[PDB]
């Protein structure tokens, strides 16, 4: 694991997905960011693994 | 012992200023004065009696217990003097059954419901050895009354969160009602009497009438039955990788 305290201050960057209570989680549980409902996206089912090799 | 309802959704409990006034040697208490006094007496009259709506010619017989209360500022002695009155036995002892009288002593003087048949039968063991004054002074001089109310505050219905039985919270909610609710509406007839002696529980709509404002009063009821079947043996299985294990 990276320690993240041994770096200089200002070099660890973080960024949230949206600064909103209502896009991170709606009134229903259909949240794209919080919880186990991050697999329910219409894309991101297949991938690009014909980039590498037949290894 | 967190209790998400208590000082959040209800009010704060009323009472005297402090308990350090008894150790003060030039006074007996922070002296409240007769606007700060009688509005505390309004809260003892609304709690020991239910909402009994006592008249002007019924409060005149309680003239002596207030005149001692505004000098000796103990709240517990005022509650003890009001439970030995004629106005407490003509409402809760005279035309009621024995477990109706006992279940209102837990409401008026403890703010909870009785947890057991063994706890309830020991209050009838004190009726045989001293009558109704042996029941009342044993509640007042108990350890449970000392470490919740003391001499300082009125005995209020306290949402604790960490009840010693879960059924104790249920019988507290049946006993208190809404604020437009007194305790003469049944003709005698203890409400908790069947559930104490059998060991079952209460009805969900009767408890959720007495819950505060803002606590989902009634939802969660499936449209099938409201209690549990003690004879049912369900199969609850856990998924492991291979199959499903019924650790029963």
């Amino acid at each position: 694991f990276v320690d993240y305290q041994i770096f200089a201050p200002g070099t660890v960057k973080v960024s949230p997905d949206s600064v909103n209570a209502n896009e991170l989680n709606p009134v229903s549980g259909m949240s794209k960011y919080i919880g186990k409902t991050q697999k329910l996206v219409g894309d991101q089912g297949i991938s690009d693994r014909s980039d590498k090799l037949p290894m | 012992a967190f209790s998400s309802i208590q000082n959040v959704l209800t009010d704060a409990p009323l009472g005297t200023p402090s308990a350090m006034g008894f150790l003060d040697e030039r006074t007996e208490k922070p002296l409240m004065g007769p606007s700060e006094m009688d509005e505390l007496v309004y809260a003892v009259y609304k709690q020991v009696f239910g909402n009994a709506h006592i008249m002007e010619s019924e409060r005149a017989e309680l003239r002596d217990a207030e005149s001692l209360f505004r000098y000796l500022r103990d709240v517990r002695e005022f509650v003890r003097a009001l439970a030995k009155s004629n106005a407490y036995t003509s409402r809760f002892l005279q035309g009621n059954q024995q477990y109706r009288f006992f279940e209102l002593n837990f409401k008026h003087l403890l703010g909870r419901g009785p947890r057991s048949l063994e706890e309830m039968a020991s209050h009838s063991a004190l009726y045989a050895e001293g009558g109704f004054e042996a029941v009342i002074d044993a509640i007042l001089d108990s350890d449970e009354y000392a470490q919740e109310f003391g001499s300082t505050v009125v005995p209020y219905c306290r949402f604790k969160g960490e009840y010693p039985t879960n059924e104790e919270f249920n019988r507290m909610l049946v006993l208190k009602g809404a604020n437009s609710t007194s305790d003469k509406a049944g003709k005698g007839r203890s409400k908790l009497c069947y559930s104490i002696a059998a060991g079952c529980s209460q009805n969900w709509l009767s408890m959720s009438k007495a819950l505060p404002f803002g606590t989902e009063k009634g939802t969660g009821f499936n449209l099938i039955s409201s209690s549990r079947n003690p004879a049912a043996r369900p199969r609850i299985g856990t998924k492991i990788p291979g199959g499903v294990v019924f650790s029963s």
């Binding site: 320690d3 993240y4 201050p9 960024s15 997905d17 600064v19 991170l24 989680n25 | 309004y42």
Partner: protein, 164 residues
């Protein structure tokens, strides 16, 4: 929901009294100090994305150790739950400036927070450093009015006091 109206009639009900001539004066204070706490509230409503974007990375510029394995913001779901929990708090600061008292904060945001954040190892000092960043980010003639900054920076350090 402690406000000016929901305390003067929760004392009028505790003695069994009518609306007194005392309590008709306390709603005359709701007429006067409304226009500094409504104009501080409406400024927060059209600027909310900007003020919680800057408040949230004040936690992470300060505390780089939170991305370590086992700490609070160790993955992107937890970073998204950090910026949610400071979007909730300043929504309640917007709510307290409408009701006029500290009612919506201490029964939706503060009650339970000692017990929730201890069990989940969320540090209180990182919650404070986000809210104390935007308390002195407030500029007195530039952002809002003079007395409107007093109302907005009364509920902020209420929340810094009650968390610490």
């Amino acid at each position: 929901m402690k406000s000016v109206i929901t305390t003067v009639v929760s004392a009028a009900d505790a003695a069994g009294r009518f609306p007194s001539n005392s309590d008709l004066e306390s709603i005359q204070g709701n007429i006067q100090r409304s226009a500094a706490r409504l104009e501080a509230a409406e400024k927060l409503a059209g600027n909310h994305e900007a003020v919680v974007k800057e408040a949230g990375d004040a936690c992470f510029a300060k505390y780089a150790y939170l991305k370590n394995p086992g700490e609070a913001g160790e993955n992107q779901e937890k970073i998204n739950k950090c910026y949610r929990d400071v979007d909730h708090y300043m929504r309640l600061v917007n709510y307290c400036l409408v009701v006029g008292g500290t009612g919506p904060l201490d029964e939706w945001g503060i009650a339970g927070a000692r017990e929730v954040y201890r069990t989940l190892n969320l540090p209180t000092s990182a919650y404070v450093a986000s809210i104390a960043y935007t308390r002195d980010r407030l500029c007195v003639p530039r952002d809002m009015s003079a007395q409107a900054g007093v109302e907005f920076s009364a509920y902020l350090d209420y929340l810094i006091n009650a968390l610490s």
